[PDB]
Each structure stands twice: as structure tokens, then as C-alpha cells.
Write a protein that binds this DNA or RNA. Structure first.
Ligand SMILES: [Mg+2]
Ligand SMILES: [Mg+2]
Ligand SMILES: [Mg+2]
Ligand SMILES: [Mg+2]
Ligand SMILES: [Mg+2]
Ligand SMILES: [Mg+2]
Ligand SMILES: [Mg+2]
Ligand SMILES: [Mg+2]
Ligand SMILES: [Mg+2]
Ligand SMILES: [Mg+2]
Ligand SMILES: [Mg+2]
Ligand SMILES: [Mg+2]
Ligand SMILES: [Mg+2]
Ligand SMILES: [Mg+2]
Ligand SMILES: [Mg+2]
Ligand SMILES: [Mg+2]
Ligand SMILES: [Mg+2]
Ligand SMILES: [Mg+2]
Ligand SMILES: [Mg+2]
Ligand SMILES: [Mg+2]
Ligand SMILES: [Mg+2]
Ligand SMILES: [Mg+2]
Ligand SMILES: [Mg+2]
Ligand SMILES: [Mg+2]
Ligand SMILES: [Mg+2]
Ligand SMILES: [Mg+2]
Ligand SMILES: [Mg+2]
Ligand SMILES: [Mg+2]
Ligand SMILES: [Mg+2]
Ligand SMILES: [Zn+2]
Lengths: 136, 52, 76, 116, 177, 66
RNA sequence: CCGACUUACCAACCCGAUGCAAACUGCGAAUACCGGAGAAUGUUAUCACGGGAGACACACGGCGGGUGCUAACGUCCGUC
RNA sequence: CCUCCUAAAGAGUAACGGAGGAGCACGAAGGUUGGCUAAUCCUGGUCGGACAUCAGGAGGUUAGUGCAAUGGCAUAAGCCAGCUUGACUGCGAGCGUGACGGCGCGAGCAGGUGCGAAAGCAGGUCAUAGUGAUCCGGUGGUUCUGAAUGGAAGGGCCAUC
RNA sequence: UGCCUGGCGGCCGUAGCGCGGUGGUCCCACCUGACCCCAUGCCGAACUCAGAAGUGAAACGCCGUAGCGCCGAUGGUAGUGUGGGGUCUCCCCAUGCGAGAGUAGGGAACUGCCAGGCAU
RNA sequence: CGUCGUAGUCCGGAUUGGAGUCUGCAACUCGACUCCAUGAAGUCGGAAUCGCUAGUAAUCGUGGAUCAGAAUGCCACGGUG
RNA sequence: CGCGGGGUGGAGCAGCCUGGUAGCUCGUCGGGCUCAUAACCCGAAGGUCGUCGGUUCAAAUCCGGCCCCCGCAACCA
RNA sequence: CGCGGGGUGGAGCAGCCUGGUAGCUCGUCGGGCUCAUAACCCGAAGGUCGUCGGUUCAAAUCCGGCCCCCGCAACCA
RNA sequence: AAAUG
């Protein structure tokens, strides 16, 4: 489960998740799973996806996780009223914009890679798509 | 607030005095400064005295 | 919580902007450091507050090898 | 390294002079020569300049990088300033210590009539 | 000054012959000889430092500077600005004299001397060495001294390469290996 | 250099077992008598003999003769 | 005692490539705000001084946010 | 009470919103004149080691700022040294900020001072926290007042607790 | 007038580094000496003075050179004021403004006043 | 008779290096002795504990057995006391 | 869940009180005592101060996080 | 702030009480003694006698300022 | 002062 080792700050503002993503292209691998939807992947979710895809690829070929859950999300404890400071950090998310290459993969046949990505995709909350290495 | 306040009194003989702070534990010796006496209108020596 | 405190706002920033005609002594900038540096006919205060030393128009400019903002007053 | 250091030493005073708006007398000393020039408050133009590098001053003197030579230079520049009507100046010692040759030059200038 | 004179005529010439130097100013010269006594035991008592300083003075005709802690360290139990060492920088004729003493007298008096380290040059010419005993210098009296102590000699030169420095030192009949 | 802070520094004669006479400036004050010097010291002569590794075979040959 | 050296080990610094930041910025808008000039328009709409107040429980909607679960006809600000 | 963010690029702007500090210190850590430039790392070097002190290179402020944070700082506001009291008295054009009480910046003028050859700078400290209105009292100065008059007491005014 | 050098600026990286070459008649630098003017919390290292035998080695200056730094369009993209709309945590349209990054490319500064040396 | 003059010493001799001698088929493990060098600890010993009443304790040397060689052990002998 | 107090060798306690320093009692180990054991006597050893970070030159000590323990408070309908 | 009383070996208390003067209770070590910790004696290390100046031959002893600890009443905006 | 085997 991915999480920042150190932090500058323990809690964080909600913020907004508008715009298009920057990590848009398949950089390292041959194939990628590009996020079509807007949302936020938790660390847990990402880990699950990784687990799904590694198994599918049967420990053959490399996987990159292009996303990182660097934003802490707070949850107020149950049966607790609305005041009294900010809630405690429960889980960590990567905020996802459309265009985000989430995962990358190489050293695999194409069909197999596709299959793996499909398997992964069902674990993630956002709508996603298979993408390829492009010259330029 | 360990720094006690003191009263620099004119050697000119005038009742004029300046006031200031002094840490008495680190500096036991008396404070002497040549300050302007506004009554004589000269720069005279001002020896330290108690604020009383 | 250990968090409810914050200090009173210091109302800093540029008070008189470029081209603005001022009287001598008029404060041009209240600032913390020398974010703006005193140029021609502008004095710098003890808290780095820039003020006009002459009547005239405020003139912001970039000058020097360190590329610093200099406020000068040009006489009208 | 050395020249740079000298410049650094000099520049604080120079800036102040500029921000006063003073017609400054700038001296420059080398182990062999001494240079003096009266520079206007704008900074871009000089009014009068005298040095041991000039043939008129050098021919009179024994050695060019000495105290007497410096004094001569100081006198010469001052006279020129007077002729041009430049009376009031400010001495820009230019990173050099006000001492020895520089000092001598300054004193000579003062003697001549430059008001500084 | 004798060694300086020797350098002026012979050593320079030798160097020129060896490296095939274009300029006479391109030749290496010994800029300064720096002597230092690191005296940690001074934090316990002041007098030891003074004694060390005196010894240094006796060794080299200058009165030593008393160096102080650049930064405080707990590992040695010292605070910033604590008088912790003493130092002499020798330049000119005095330096030359010291050098003459060092090679012609002091080094010979080193107990069990089988040479100086040739691979001890910092990489850019400047040689350094250290003596275990201060009594190797004939300036210190054997009977007078209470505490045994030493010092480090640092010969700083204009030489760009260490090899050049080495060569220079050899030209001055420096012992080496 | 500074006038008063420095120790006394005057030329002395440094005699030796060599016969070598060495006029040098020093803080000693009195005339100096040395045991060894740079010219005397057995660096060039000693260090060949001073190691003395040798061999065992030769030793064996010497004392037994077979 | 100086150690000799390899082998699907974790790995600082540096280089190449990839992202993230309310409390990062070698960049940097639109708006907004301050100042000057000009035009038309507007019942002076502006400022000052004086007489009289009321009000200081706000509500929702839009846009920018904090908090909450990017919950609430929730909550607290900014702005119309 | 101070610093940052929230705060929407002027100012301001809330929450039992997110983070941190202050209730001082300093007769030098103030003034000025003169000089100087940092962290860290590598190499060599007696004891001496990851880490004292000495060299030299790389390095380029990653350091420093009496303390929180922010903005500043080489002209250094950072670090030394000499001489010193401007941590002056009366004022103060003109501004800034506050509902107000207030709080802040301030060139220049008069007197008198310090540093500098001189130009100049100096009305505390790099700046922003380090604080408490009024009343009631206490001490010192001041012929201002002084209940018939001379005094005095008490009061006032300036300084101060 | 032309080249070279020195000083003071403007300008503040198209100006800065790096690598290679180059200059000593003059200048500049290193340099020689120091009883003295003055100086080192030791040291003529620096500061300073008296000098001119030597060398441009270092430094500094000049010339070249795209290994960097730096500058940098056009186009597109993001954002956004106003108005309107939707599938409304976000978007789109009309209209105005329009980045940052990157790309083509540029780029080894330019320039004013005074002084000196050598030339024409 | 001379010297050292209260020191870790001209005390103390451990340990180690080198050179040897003798015994013995043979001295690496594992002998004794000699020479030159080397010169630890130790400055009268905590709780505790032993022997001795006279030619005894204490101290000084000498010899023998066992033995090729190999005693600070044992068994004896005298000196001073 | 909130407010306090604590975690220091085998054990129980100190120190933390304004940062530099490791103490007491018992136990453990080696002697001596006894025929032997116990008691008693002498001499020793043994602590990364719960853990992980932070700040001063420097932390058992100050601050924060996490784990464990001990109190208290966890309410009015 | 006003007044009074004290700062005495490592600790507290006498010596001040109108100068000619370092004792007491322990504490520590060593010796004797005991089965001994102890009880007990002998011997010793350990005090600008708050600090400094003055009167005087002579002061911790008298006084003056100054520093600290304690007591005192007192109002305290 | 002195418990046990
Ligand atoms: Mg983004
Ligand atoms: Mg931001
Ligand atoms: Mg109300
Ligand atoms: Mg309200
Ligand atoms: Mg409201
Ligand atoms: Mg909203
Ligand atoms: Mg409704
Ligand atoms: Mg709502
Ligand atoms: Mg509501
Ligand atoms: Mg909301
Ligand atoms: Mg609203
Ligand atoms: Mg704002
Ligand atoms: Mg705004
Ligand atoms: Mg300065
Ligand atoms: Mg200062
Ligand atoms: Mg300061
Ligand atoms: Mg400050
Ligand atoms: Mg009241
Ligand atoms: Mg009356
Ligand atoms: Mg060159
Ligand atoms: Mg464009
Ligand atoms: Mg662009
Ligand atoms: Mg270039
Ligand atoms: Mg011993
Ligand atoms: Mg036998
Ligand atoms: Mg316990
Ligand atoms: Mg303590
Ligand atoms: Mg037993
Ligand atoms: Mg500790
Ligand atoms: Zn000899």
C-alpha cells in the first residue's frame, strides 16, 4: 500500500480535481492503462489493481505504477458532531484527471497485456482505457 | 522578567534622570553613560541609581 | 485542538502605485523585507517602509545586477 | 579575486554617493601609477582627470608610484577642477585605505582648493 | 636564508631542466610553512595550552595564534569559541630559516627515522607532515619539558601538481623514502 | 613583524660530530652542540644494512656444511 | 594485521526519464484594485458637516473556497 | 500579541479550520569607521578517531540572522577589530492603519553629542511578537497653584514606579 | 582618425560558466625589498610604503569555439472576465483576454565619457 | 673496602628475539643449561587463614634418591640464629 | 473518545525538577565461613533509560508520533 | 517597597552581644576494638567565617553600601 | 549471636 514516507504536513485541504492530466503518455513501458474518467484512486485501490495485473502477467515483464497516493484524506470518527477540528488521516489518494496513465507495462504480448489491464480496471473506481507506445 | 529597571541620574546636579533596564545578575557593576541633560542642555555623565 | 490562533493583519503592500503623484513623506510601500528597494528620492524606514523624500510621481523600475524592484520619485 | 574584493569594498560608498547626487573625485592607485578623476553626479561623464600616466606630470617627477607623485597628481587635478569651476566634491577612495599615497593626494587636493 | 639563496640559483634551474618549463614564474615555490598544535587537553586546564604555545614559539621564532572552535561538538566536549589549538604561519626569511633547521637538524634528531612519506601531498603540491615529539627540535630542552607533545608541519607551495611539489622538495634534499 | 610580542631570535653557531659548522638563526640563545646532521645521518648508508632480510638456505649451508 | 573477491541482496550522492503540493516557485494570466487623460450619459449620482434612525438572528441561488462523506434545505468565509 | 496558509495575484476576510511561536534578550548583541565572506564534501597532515586544530581544492550561501514563521539581507541586515553613547532633548511637513481608545512610518528644523580624513551616518537592535487603558496611589524635579495675608499642606505640570 | 590598454559608468545572463588559443613598447598584473609612514587577535599572506632585476606562469584582457546556462517566436493547449447552456464534485457554446512548458530558431553582448600607448 | 641514595630504581626478574652447549636414534609439539639482547606484574597483599616453645621459628647454603638427560618437589646435612 | 500519571538491568524503586553526571534495596557471579547448606563477610559484573522521529553542540531527561500499562472522566433527557 | 533577624568546614547551630578568641551535632577517611554493622576513643583532611570598604594595633565581633535566605505588618490601581 | 541436613 503506497504512502509517502515523510510529509511536510500531516493533514491537507480538500481541493478540487478539475483539469486534464499531465502524465499522459506511455513513457517507460510499451502499453498503458490511461484514465478516461475523473476521480481519486486510493492507495488500497492502486495496490489491488497492481495485484490483479501482476498475477495476470504471471511475474513476466515489468510493471510501472505511474500514479502515487500523495494526498491524505481525513475522516471524522463515527457518532461525532460537526465541530472540534479536522478529522484524522485515514487513507491516501492520488487525485486522477482524465488522461492519466495509471499503469504501464512491457515485456508482454499485446493481447495478454490488454487482458491484464482489463482485470486491473475492474478494481479501480474510474473509467479507463488501454493505450500504446507512440513514436512522438 | 528578570531584567530589573533602573534610573540613570545626572551628575550635573539637576533632578533629571533617564530610565532603563539592566540585568543585575550578569552585570553587578554600575552603569555610566554620557547622556544629554535637557535642563542644562549639555551632554553630562549619568550614573546608575535605584528606581525607588 | 492546538490550532485556533492567528495574528492581526498588518495591512502591508503597495500603497501608492506607478504614476501616482504623492506629497513628500507619503508612504509608498509597507513591506517586511526590502521586497522593493528605495531608489531616487525615496527613503527607507526602519521597518523597510518606503516613503517619498520629495513631492512627485511614483516610478517603479527593475534595476541593477540582482534585478531588484526600485521605487523612485520623479519630480513633476 | 583582489580587484573584485576592492570593488566590493568600494561599492557601498559609491552607491551612497550616487544616492546623494554628488560630484565625486575618484582616485585609482596602482603599484606603478596613480589616477585621479572628477566625475559628475550622473556618473556617465568625467569633468577633469589627472594622472602620473600623463606626460606633463610624469616628466617633473622622479618615480610615478610614490607619495610625492600622488601629491602632485592631487594638486593637478584640483587645479583643473578649480579652472573648470568645480569647487565642491566628495572623495571616493575606491576601496583603497585612506592612508599613504591616497591620503597624500587628497591632502594636496585640499591644499589646492577643492572643498571636501 | 641560505636555502632561499640555494633555491634562487640552483633549485629553480634544476626544476627547469626537469619539467621543461617555459616561464621562470611557472616554477613552484614554497609559499608558507604552517605549524599547528592541536591541544584538546586545554579544556580541562588553561595552562597546558599556554605551555604548548610557548613550545611552538621556541620551535619557530614567531609568537603563535591561539585558534578557536569553528563549531561546537559534544563528541569532544567543546563549545564554539573555545581556545582549542595554537598555530604559527611562517613566511619569508624566517620560514626559510625554519625549513633549514627542519631538514639539517630536526628531522635527523627524529627517533627511529627511516624516512618521510612520499605519498602525502594533498594532490596539488602542498606537502604535510607531523612529529610525535617536540624535543626533536634543539630549541626545546629535554629537562625543562613536563608534558610530551607534538606538532604538524604543513609546507604549502605554488605547485599545481603533487609530482611537481615532490620534485621541488627533492631538489631541496628532502629525506622522503 | 610586531616589536615586543615575539621571542628573542639571534644567530648561533651549531657545532657537530662531523666537523660541520652551521651558522643558523635560533631562539636557543647559547652556542649549540649537535650529535647528527643531514650530511651525517645514516639514511644513504644505513637503510640497506638496517633492513637485513637475508636468507635461511645460506645460513644452513654455513653452519652444517653437510 | 593490511585483507582477497563474487552474487537474482537493500541502497545515499550524481545523471537521464515520470508525476504530486493550501502552508514549494528559476514562470505566470484573466479578472480585480490604485493612479492619470479623454467622451457621452446620469434629476450630484460624490464628499464634508449637522438633525433623526433603524440594524448588528439573515435565507437561498450562482461562481472561488475552508469544514463535512468534493453528505445535508449542513456549516463558515469571499464575491454577485 | 506575532508568523505562515485558508484568503479567490491591492487591503481586508470566518470556522472548536491547518501549522508554529511571544509575555523577552542585549551597556553591546546599540552607534560609527576600517576590514572580512558562509554550509558541506574530498585529499594530505603528531596524538586525533564519522566529528576538534592546520593546509589546499571542489563548492557557491545549500550558511548565518540572540529566539517562531514569513519576507529580507554581499552595498551585506552575516563575521571580526578600533574609537564611542544618537538606546540623544525639543519638534516634526507629510503619510499609513484603526469605529474610537490608539498603534505605526517619517524627511527636515533647533539645541547638544559620537564615529569618520571627508562625503556622510547615528532619535536603539534586519523587520514583523516580548504586552495592559482609566482610576487610585509612590518617588524625584518644577514658585504653576496656594480658601484673610505670609508661608505650608494638598493639587497641577514634566519625569518615573 | 584605427588598433590596443586603463579608469568611471549605462545596461543586468543574446552579457554567465566551460574548452582551446593569445598579449607585456605602453598599461595592468604578478614581482624586489622593507630601518622608516602603516600593518599582522602569528605571519610585509592581506593592508602599507620604497621600488623596477624578471615574467606574463597565475591573474586580467582579447580572439575563437554551441559542452552547458541564457533568450526565444508562430501555432496549439491550459486558465479566465461577461453572457448563455448541459450529462452540473465537472464541463460545453458565444464573445473578449490568453499563459506556463515545449518547438523552430537566436545566442560566445552591445554601448557612453575621460585618460594613456602605438599606428596612419 | 668500594659503589648505588628510596626511584618501579644499578629493585624485581617474568616474557619474548637472536646465538649456542650437553644429554640422547631423536630435544617441533615437549628438556636442561649458557651467552647477548629484551626488562611484565609487583612498592608487603580484601574477607579470611597456617606453622612454630629452642638450637625451635626465620634465613643461608650443601648432598642424595628416581635419573641417558630432565626439581622451586621429596628425603637428608650442616651455618647463623 | 477526553484529561492526567507512568514504561529506567532479574525485580521493585530513584533520577527526569529545568539538558550534559546512571544512585538505593534485593537478585546474579567469584572468593572466604561450615563436614555441608542457609544466614553472615569480602570483592566484582551487569542499563541504546518502551519505540521511532525531531530541536540544542549535546537527550533518560525537552517536544511530537506510535505501542503498552495505571488512574480519572465518559454526563441531562 | 517599609522594618527586624540571619548567611559559620558538606549541612545546620555557638563564637557577634561592643574587637584582642574556629568550637557543636553529625558527615568522610585511617587506626584500636569487637563475630561484628554498630557503641566507644584516638588522629586527620575540610571554612574571601554572605561580599566589599571604612575606624583602629587588633573584627566573623562596630558600621556603611551591596547580594541572598527568612520573618513582619502593610496596601496593592 | 548459632536455622537446617
Ligand atoms: Mg496538475
Ligand atoms: Mg500556490
Ligand atoms: Mg449582537
Ligand atoms: Mg450576527
Ligand atoms: Mg452570513
Ligand atoms: Mg459553494
Ligand atoms: Mg425548497
Ligand atoms: Mg450545501
Ligand atoms: Mg443554511
Ligand atoms: Mg460547502
Ligand atoms: Mg454565497
Ligand atoms: Mg490579500
Ligand atoms: Mg483579491
Ligand atoms: Mg560595514
Ligand atoms: Mg550591526
Ligand atoms: Mg543585531
Ligand atoms: Mg529580530
Ligand atoms: Mg476601578
Ligand atoms: Mg493662605
Ligand atoms: Mg597566461
Ligand atoms: Mg501563443
Ligand atoms: Mg511562451
Ligand atoms: Mg566567453
Ligand atoms: Mg607497576
Ligand atoms: Mg640427577
Ligand atoms: Mg519498577
Ligand atoms: Mg539536573
Ligand atoms: Mg553458603
Ligand atoms: Mg545524558
Ligand atoms: Zn653531524
Amino acid at each position: 500500500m503506497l504512502q509517502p514516507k515523510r510529509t511536510k504536513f500531516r493533514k491537507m485541504h480538500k481541493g478540487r480535481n478539475r483539469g486534464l492530466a499531465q502524465g499522459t503518455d506511455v513513457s517507460f513501458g510499451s502499453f498503458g492503462l490511461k484514465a478516461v474518467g475523473r476521480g481519486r484512486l486510493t492507495a488500497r485501490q492502486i495496490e489491488a489493481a497492481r495485484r490483479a495485473m501482476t498475477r495476470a502477467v504471471k511475474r513476466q515483464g515489468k510493471i510501472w505504477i505511474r500514479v502515487f497516493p500523495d494526498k491524505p484524506i481525513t475522516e471524522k470518527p463515527l457518532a461525532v458532531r460537526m465541530g472540534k477540528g479536522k478529522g484524522n488521516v485515514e487513507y491516501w489518494v492520488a487525485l486522477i484527471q482524465p488522461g492519466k496513465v495509471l499503469y504501464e507495462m512491457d515485456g508482454v504480448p499485446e493481447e495478454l497485456a490488454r487482458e491484464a489491464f482489463k482485470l486491473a480496471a475492474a478494481k479501480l473506481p474510474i473509467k479507463t482505457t488501454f493505450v500504446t507506445k507512440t513514436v512522438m | 522578567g528578570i531584567r530589573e529597571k533602573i534610573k540613570l541620574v545626572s551628575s550635573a546636579g539637576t533632578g533629571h534622570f533617564y530610565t532603563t533596564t539592566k540585568n543585575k545578575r550578569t552585570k553587578p557593576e554600575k552603569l555610566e553613560l554620557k547622556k544629554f541633560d535637557p535642563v542644562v542642555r549639555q551632554h553630562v555623565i549619568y550614573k546608575e541609581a535605584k528606581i525607588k | 485542538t492546538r490550532n485556533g490562533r492567528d495574528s492581526e493583519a498588518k495591512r502591508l503592500g503597495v500603497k501608492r502605485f506607478g504614476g501616482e503623484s504623492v506629497l513628500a513623506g507619503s508612504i509608498i510601500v509597507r513591506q517586511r523585507g526590502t521586497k522593493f528597494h528605495a531608489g531616487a528620492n525615496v527613503g527607507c524606514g526602519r521597518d523597510h517602509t518606503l516613503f517619498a523624500k520629495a513631492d512627485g510621481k511614483v516610478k517603479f523600475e527593475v534595476k541593477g545586477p540582482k534585478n531588484r524592484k526600485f521605487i523612485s520619485i520623479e519630480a513633476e | 579575486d583582489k580587484k573584485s574584493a576592492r570593488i566590493r569594498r568600494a561599492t557601498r560608498a559609491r552607491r551612497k554617493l550616487q544616492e546623494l547626487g554628488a560630484t565625486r573625485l575618484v582616485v585609482h592607485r596602482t603599484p606603478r601609477h596613480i589616477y585621479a578623476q572628477v566625475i559628475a553626479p550622473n556618473g556617465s561623464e568625467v569633468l577633469v582627470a589627472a594622472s602620473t600616466v600623463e606626460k606633463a606630470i610624469a616628466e617633473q617627477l622622479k618615480y610615478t608610484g610614490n607619495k610625492d607623485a600622488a601629491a602632485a597628481v592631487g594638486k593637478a587635478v584640483a587645479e583643473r577642477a578649480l579652472e573648470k569651476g568645480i569647487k565642491d566634491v566628495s572623495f571616493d577612495r575606491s576601496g583603497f585605505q585612506y592612508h599613504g599615497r591616497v591620503q597624500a593626494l587628497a591632502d594636496a587636493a585640499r591644499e589646492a582648493g577643492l572643498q571636501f | 636564508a641560505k636555502l632561499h639563496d640555494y633555491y634562487k640559483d640552483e633549485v629553480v634551474k634544476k626544476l627547469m631542466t626537469e619539467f621543461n618549463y617555459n616561464s621562470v614564474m611557472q616554477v613552484p615555490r614554497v609559499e608558507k610553512i604552517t605549524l599547528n598544535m592541536g591541544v584538546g587537553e586545554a579544556i580541562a586546564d588553561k595552562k597546558l595550552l599556554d605551555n604548548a604555545a610557548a613550545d611552538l614559539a621556541a620551535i619557530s621564532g614567531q609568537k603563535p595564534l591561539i585558534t578557536k572552535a569553528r563549531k561546537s561538538v559534544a563528541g569532544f566536549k567543546i563549545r564554539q569559541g573555545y581556545p582549542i589549538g595554537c598555530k604559527v604561519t611562517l613566511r619569508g626569511e624566517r620560514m626559510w630559516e625554519f625549513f633549514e633547521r627542519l631538514i639539517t637538524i630536526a628531522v635527523p634528531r627524529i627517533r627511529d627515522f627511516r624516512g618521510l612519506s612520499a605519498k602525502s601531498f594533498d594532490g596539488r603540491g602542498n606537502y604535510s607532515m607531523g612529529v610525535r615529539e617536540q624535543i626533536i627540535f634543539p630549541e626545546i630542552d629535554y629537562d625543562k619539558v613536563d608534558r610530551v607533545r607534538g606538532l604538524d608541519i604543513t609546507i604549502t607551495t605554488t605547485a599545481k601538481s603533487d609530482e611537481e611539489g615532490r620534485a621541488l622538495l627533492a631538489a631541496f634534499d628532502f629525506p622522503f623514502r | 613583524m610586531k616589536k615586543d610580542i615575539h621571542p628573542k631570535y639571534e644567530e648561533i653557531t651549531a657545532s657537530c660530530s662531523c666537523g660541520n659548522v652551521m651558522k643558523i638563526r635560533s631562539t636557543v640563545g647559547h652556542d649549540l652542540n649537535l650529535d647528527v646532521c643531514s650530511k651525517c645521518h645514516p639514511f644513504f648508508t644505513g637503510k640497506q644494512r638496517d633492513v637485513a632480510t637475508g636468507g635461511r638456505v645460506d645460513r644452513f649451508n654455513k653452519r652444517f656444511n653437510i
